[PDB]
Nucleic acid binder design. Structure first.
Length: 179
DNA sequence: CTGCTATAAAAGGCTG
DNA sequence: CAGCCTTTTATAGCAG
């Protein structure tokens, strides 16, 4: 297509390998908060890579907001180090990229009303509920949110190649419905 | 503007 | 048990 989807968000998980005292973490770490009555984890943030972590008493952690796999792992290690420095016997076990989000612009308006008819088996489009056509692709297994503006969001990927494969698969289809 | 509408994914505690 | 809740991010509609 000559168009490369840009990564906008990465969700990763890692296991610190030890029970954690969320109250202690919340009290001592800057940009760390804990309100068990609202959510069961410590919400911690760092400005670089700009991300947000959810740290559970179990030792498991969720890292969100990075723009790349590297940046996601880098952020996860920084959060792990913070917990480690606090005094907990933290490890860095089974780090894994769980979801990746990409977006691009095909630079032409799309006749979503048309796409939905021909690709009924993969599309959900109710403009009065949400303006984007939701395309549930099978191979690769990725969900695309296709807009009239020609903007496209792709999500559900574990590796970037899946975002690229999905976009390359949809491109010839969107061209067939230029508005 | 805010907070909804929809998408994926994980963590784990909570309600139904 | 299932499903909600929170967190992130592109996208773009809506009522207040």
């Amino acid at each position: 297509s000559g168009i490369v989807p840009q990564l906008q968000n990465i969700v990763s998980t890692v296991n610190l390998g030890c029970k954690l005292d969320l109250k202690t973490i919340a009290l001592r770490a800057r940009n760390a908060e804990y309100n068990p009555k609202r959510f069961a984890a410590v919400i911690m943030r760092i400005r670089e890579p700009r991300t947000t972590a959810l740290i559970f008493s179990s030792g498991k952690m969720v890292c969100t907001g990075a723009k790349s796999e590297e940046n996601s792992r880098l952020a996860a290690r920084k959060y792990a180090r913070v917990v480690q420095k606090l005094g907990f016997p933290a490890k860095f076990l089974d780090f894994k990229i769980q979801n990746m989000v990409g977006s691009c612009d095909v630079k032409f308006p799309i006749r979503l009303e048309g796409l939905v008819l021909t690709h009924q088996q993969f599309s959900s489009y109710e403009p009065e509920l949400f303006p984007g056509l939701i395309y549930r692709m099978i191979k690769p297994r990725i969900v695309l949110l296709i807009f009239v503006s020609g903007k496209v969001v792709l999500t559900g990927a574990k590796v970037r190649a899946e975002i690229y494969e999905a976009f390359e698969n949809i491109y010839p289809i969107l061209k067939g419905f230029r508005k």
